[PDB]
Design a protein around this nucleic acid. Structure first.
Ligand SMILES: [K+]
Ligand SMILES: [K+]
Ligand SMILES: [K+]
Ligand SMILES: [K+]
Ligand SMILES: [K+]
Ligand SMILES: [Mg+2]
Ligand SMILES: [Mg+2]
Ligand SMILES: [Mg+2]
Ligand SMILES: [Mg+2]
Ligand SMILES: [Mg+2]
Ligand SMILES: [Mg+2]
Ligand SMILES: [Mg+2]
Ligand SMILES: [Mg+2]
Ligand SMILES: [Mg+2]
Ligand SMILES: [Mg+2]
Ligand SMILES: [Mg+2]
Ligand SMILES: [Mg+2]
Ligand SMILES: [Mg+2]
Ligand SMILES: [Mg+2]
Ligand SMILES: [Mg+2]
Ligand SMILES: [Mg+2]
Ligand SMILES: [Mg+2]
Ligand SMILES: [Mg+2]
Ligand SMILES: [Mg+2]
Ligand SMILES: [Mg+2]
Ligand SMILES: [Mg+2]
Ligand SMILES: [Mg+2]
Ligand SMILES: [Mg+2]
Ligand SMILES: [Mg+2]
Ligand SMILES: [Mg+2]
Ligand SMILES: [Mg+2]
Ligand SMILES: [Mg+2]
Ligand SMILES: [Mg+2]
Ligand SMILES: [Mg+2]
Ligand SMILES: [Mg+2]
Ligand SMILES: [Mg+2]
Ligand SMILES: [Mg+2]
Ligand SMILES: [Mg+2]
Ligand SMILES: [Mg+2]
Ligand SMILES: [Mg+2]
Ligand SMILES: [Mg+2]
Ligand SMILES: [Mg+2]
Ligand SMILES: [Mg+2]
Ligand SMILES: [Mg+2]
Ligand SMILES: [Mg+2]
Ligand SMILES: [Mg+2]
Ligand SMILES: [Mg+2]
Ligand SMILES: [Mg+2]
Ligand SMILES: [Mg+2]
Ligand SMILES: [Mg+2]
Ligand SMILES: [Mg+2]
Ligand SMILES: [Mg+2]
Ligand SMILES: [Mg+2]
Ligand SMILES: [Mg+2]
Ligand SMILES: [Mg+2]
Ligand SMILES: [Mg+2]
Ligand SMILES: [Mg+2]
Ligand SMILES: [Mg+2]
Ligand SMILES: [Mg+2]
Ligand SMILES: [Mg+2]
Length: 181
RNA sequence: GCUAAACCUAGCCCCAAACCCACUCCACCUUACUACCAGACAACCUUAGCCAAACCAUUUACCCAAAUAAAGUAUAGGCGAUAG
RNA sequence: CCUAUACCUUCUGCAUAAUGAAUUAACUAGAAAUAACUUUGCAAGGAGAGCCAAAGCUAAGACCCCCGAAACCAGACGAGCUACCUAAGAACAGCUAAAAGAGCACACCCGUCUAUGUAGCAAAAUAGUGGGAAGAUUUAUAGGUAGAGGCGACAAACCUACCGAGCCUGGUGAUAGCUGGUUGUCCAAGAUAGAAUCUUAGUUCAACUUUAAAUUUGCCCACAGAACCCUCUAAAUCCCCUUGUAAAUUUAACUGUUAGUCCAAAGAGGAACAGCUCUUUGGACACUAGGAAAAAACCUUGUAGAGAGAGUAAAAAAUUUAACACCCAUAGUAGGCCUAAAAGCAGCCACCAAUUAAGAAAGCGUUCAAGCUCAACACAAAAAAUCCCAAACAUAUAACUGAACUCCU
RNA sequence: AACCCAACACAGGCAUGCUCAUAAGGAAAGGUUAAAAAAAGUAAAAGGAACUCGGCAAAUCUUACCCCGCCUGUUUACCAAAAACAUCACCUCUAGCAUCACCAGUAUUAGAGGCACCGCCUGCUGGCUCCACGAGGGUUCAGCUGUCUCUUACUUUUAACCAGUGAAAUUGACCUGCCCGUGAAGAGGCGGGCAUAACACAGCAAGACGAGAAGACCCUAUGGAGCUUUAAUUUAUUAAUGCAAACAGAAACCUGCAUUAAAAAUUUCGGUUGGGGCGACCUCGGAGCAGAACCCAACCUCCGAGCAGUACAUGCUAAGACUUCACCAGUCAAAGCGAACACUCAAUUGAUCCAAUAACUUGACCAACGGAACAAGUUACCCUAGGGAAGCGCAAUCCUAUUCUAGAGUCCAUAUCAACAAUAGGGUUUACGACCUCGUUGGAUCAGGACAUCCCGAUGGUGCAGCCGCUAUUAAAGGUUCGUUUGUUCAACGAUUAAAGUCCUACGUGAUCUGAGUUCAGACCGGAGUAAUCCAGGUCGGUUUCUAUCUACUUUCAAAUUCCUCCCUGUACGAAAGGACAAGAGAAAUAAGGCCUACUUCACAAAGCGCCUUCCCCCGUAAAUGAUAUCAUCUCAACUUAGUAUACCCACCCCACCCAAGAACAGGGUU
């Protein structure tokens, strides 16, 4: 039914918090192999499955090649931190904006999770720096994070730029931000 | 050669016969064996079950007062184990 | 030196590393009658009333074990442990705080984690670390609720150190198609068709086996004889005079056995080569000995003792594998077709031909050519994990060795 | 009284008043030695979680979240203290009443329950938010430290020795060896070899499928029990009504009978298919099905049968036979009597009792079809009696190596690679629902071995210029890293390395250690079921113990491997780019064997983090001469060439003391 076990993680969050609905434009960072992309398309009706509900848009970005999926557009190879990808992302989305940002990016585990904590935080911050360009006001932001002390700095910056920030908990920690300023 | 080994009574069993014990003084139903104050308290009512029927559910011998014989016969019984 | 794999029990098969046994002494386990048989008495009658009798009747002799559940029921005994409750008592430093099912922290209660301990100090403890510690707190004393029940802030907790239903006595020598055991000597006969079953761990019947009795055929087997199909097709079998032999049927009285295992052979399981499972035939084993290394099932051999005799049966694996040509080739022609051109060799139609004698090319090499050789002319493998595994030996005439089979005293 | 309860002169239990460190009460060391292992502490260079399932323990005093529950409290006394129960608050249901409970109460009351405060949205009930709190389950900052890299020293107990006292489990007999093979399939006892004077003491834990249990795994019993229910059999019991009885003139009580509910009692789970879900099956006939007398292949494969029609002597009797391997049942039948002039059909069926009937006769998908008159689930709370639980040569399938020479590799079978197949070795699967699922392993320590070689080494081929690849032969002496979990349990990822090999060894190894699964006593989430309860599902928590009798073993006493830099050398090679061998020097690491001068932990010493030493070949191939086969040809032809050990150890007073010697013993010194 799904390409990766990470698909159930997004469904569980969506079930409780209701972050995906038809008509929403969703960006999937680190979309490979496509576990979150499949979940997003079904919820936002990106493939136009339900004629009575508005058709959303799903865009997947990852370094590795992603196999084609019905109702989803994928950009690969592309670096999320590369300004070139951000410009390409805007040209593809309707109205050059997105409604929901989903992030599952994870750098290679260098064998020291403490080092991997700050490295993953910087990647989230880099996405957060370019987030205003991609995200529209009042949107939803979800990122995959590894627990650590630097999560507070990410939490502090999200708290200033978002009305509400939630902590969602493998040893993964997910930050759910809604109502972008 | 040490540890040991050996013994013959104590008494008992089954019948017969015959119908058995129960006050020296003191204490003993209250916390028994505790000398010495007002209580009311009163006994009685089918046994069941294991077990047998190769389960189990009706049912399944239990001295009831003469040994023998009538006779395991007449009867009873998921008419069957068995009972008589 | 040579030979030899403890005993009991449970299974087809136990040296088995399956069960039981440290050992010694004592104790500990087949109880019964209808019939039948045998031995006496009497006899158409028998018996010391009854009862049987178409030779019976009376009496004697002679056959039927031990230990073990979890359970059920009845009547007693239990709340001095513990669960909850009743009556009337007691305990709770210090500090911060506030009139706190507050915080810190002794006494006290509890028992989170770790380690020690594991027949221990202890049938639940010690040490450290912990939770609570003015409260739904803890605790002393007396009383209460009792098993078809009590009690329970439900853990199916607790109710006197094994509570999904306490303990004790009695019914009780409960029952157990299950486990284990079942005691002196010697001889004899003795194994594998099935059917039914709340039945496949059992039992009944049959088959088989045993004993006694009566009787006359039994086994082996000459021809003859036993079906057509779906076309045809195996080893055989039944029947059965002779003959070799000595068994067979019937009657009487009962026990026990009844998935056998492996080997040879033919088959069965969706038309499945082995293996598995399951039938059929035969052998062996659960019966001795010898031989294949050790070996229940292969081969040899069975009827039982002693001998410091003898003759034989089966009975010891073989095999060691790859050379090779010598010489020569000029030419009617790049034989035509098609193809950029493909010529002897991209393909193809044709297969002639000079010279003593040479394919209108048999393999190679060129995009294609070139180059070459040949024809012709002369001249049959092996590799795994503790450590290879009898020692050895090509050449003195095949006899000898070898049993509990046979013979001999 | 030195005292009770715990089997003990028991490290446990034990109310209150004072003393709060004593004015009272006591003795941890029997003596010796300073081994190993084990226990408890103390100290530690540099690093500071790299250890590990987990920051368990220890040190230091240490932040910020997530999940669940509100909180304090309560529970499985003896493996679960929790997320479970209780809890204010809220909700539902029932009750109009006094003389032993509720209650000496009366709807703002009492009882039976759900749920778990509050706040918010919502239905008119459900869903969230949140204050604190927790020996709850995860994660993390910082600090901390022997958790580890990598262990070390010391003290005490233990230990060993001398003296006194003196157990237990255990045990068929033992005069108790190793390697292969074999075997009831894992041999100290059997076979073939080898080894072998006899004896203690101290260690070790490979074996004696080690000892004492328990748990688990299915299976069996016409063995139990608990629970649940629309399993069967009942309403005795209790309550409510009706009726009779009884009385008064209406009633009430009592009793009998009957009908309802309540509650309770008794009993049981039929076989077959590895288990379970879903299904099928059990009797009779036919075929595959035993080719020729009869019988005989279960399982399995496939088609049927549980009737119908025609008779109305389908009447009555009676020789002799067959028989589904027993019995029961079933089948054929001359003659005779009486009439006319043993029905077709492979199966087409059911015993006894009983019931009905004047009688003749009739009655069960008793289909579980030799049939009990009538009884289902569940147990992980389970109990009892038992029985089972490494190995199975030739077909299929997969892999490896050859064979075949098709086909790729510009040309080119054979530098590499390879189809259709075959031949050898290895592994796996296999008799029936052309259903679906489910039934021991890591790590620490120490390793033994195989070679089918990952690295180092030797040698051919190459589409090998040179470095560096590919391929093959040969080689097992030596080596084969440290970490993290997102793409988690040995799979990806990070940094490295000459390389991070494939395996076997009862996961090699649990009487050396530990984690998880198979799973269990508690508990929720999802699913199933009326319920009890269940699920290979998700999650949290959660007890095995062992004093070594025997075998084996306890200094092989001694030969070292690898990398990097430099040198040759920027040389050979190549157009450049790039870029070597061999020989030597130096340096580092690891391993093995030692040491204390310094350094460090520390001090008459031990020890590493310190220092010192380390020495043989390899057998694949490459060449000469030279016959069989007068050439040639490295020759399972005669022949030639290349690469075809030493060291250590070694004599024979002792009372007592000392020691760098040591558990005891022994040994060295005592001039
Ligand atoms: K009491
Ligand atoms: K004193
Ligand atoms: K807690
Ligand atoms: K051992
Ligand atoms: K039956
Ligand atoms: Mg019975
Ligand atoms: Mg029963
Ligand atoms: Mg042995
Ligand atoms: Mg024994
Ligand atoms: Mg004796
Ligand atoms: Mg009963
Ligand atoms: Mg009490
Ligand atoms: Mg009171
Ligand atoms: Mg106080
Ligand atoms: Mg308090
Ligand atoms: Mg406190
Ligand atoms: Mg309580
Ligand atoms: Mg419960
Ligand atoms: Mg329970
Ligand atoms: Mg008995
Ligand atoms: Mg005999
Ligand atoms: Mg039956
Ligand atoms: Mg004859
Ligand atoms: Mg003789
Ligand atoms: Mg020629
Ligand atoms: Mg002889
Ligand atoms: Mg003889
Ligand atoms: Mg001492
Ligand atoms: Mg030690
Ligand atoms: Mg340190
Ligand atoms: Mg830290
Ligand atoms: Mg690690
Ligand atoms: Mg780690
Ligand atoms: Mg971790
Ligand atoms: Mg700790
Ligand atoms: Mg609580
Ligand atoms: Mg509060
Ligand atoms: Mg407990
Ligand atoms: Mg308690
Ligand atoms: Mg606990
Ligand atoms: Mg609760
Ligand atoms: Mg608490
Ligand atoms: Mg003893
Ligand atoms: Mg010996
Ligand atoms: Mg062996
Ligand atoms: Mg010893
Ligand atoms: Mg049975
Ligand atoms: Mg039951
Ligand atoms: Mg017959
Ligand atoms: Mg039957
Ligand atoms: Mg029959
Ligand atoms: Mg449970
Ligand atoms: Mg090397
Ligand atoms: Mg080799
Ligand atoms: Mg072991
Ligand atoms: Mg815990
Ligand atoms: Mg030991
Ligand atoms: Mg060099
Ligand atoms: Mg020559
Ligand atoms: Mg030559």
């Amino acid at each position: 039914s799904y390409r990766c076990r990470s698909a159930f993680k997004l469904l569980e969050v969506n079930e409780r918090h209701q972050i995906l609905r038809p008509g929403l434009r969703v960006l999937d960072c680190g979309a490979a192999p496509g576990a979150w992309s499949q979940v997003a398309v079904q919820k936002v009706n990106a493939a136009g499955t339900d004629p009575s509900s508005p058709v959303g848009f799903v865009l997947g970005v990852d370094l590795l090649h992603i196999f084609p999926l019905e109702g989803a557009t994928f950009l690969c190879p592309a670096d999320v931190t590369d300004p070139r990808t951000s410009q390409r992302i805007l040209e593809v989305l309707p109205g050059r904006r997105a409604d929901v940002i989903l992030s599952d990016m994870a750098p290679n585990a260098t064998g020291f999770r403490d080092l991997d904590h700050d490295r993953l935080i910087s990647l989230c911050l880099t996405l957060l720096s370019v987030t205003p360009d991609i995200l529209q006001p009042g949107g939803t932001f979800l990122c995959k994070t590894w627990a650590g002390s630097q999560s507070r700095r990410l939490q502090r910056r999200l708290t200033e730029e978002f009305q509400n920030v939630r902590i969602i908990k493998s040893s993964e920690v997910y930050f759910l931000a809604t109502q972008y300023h």
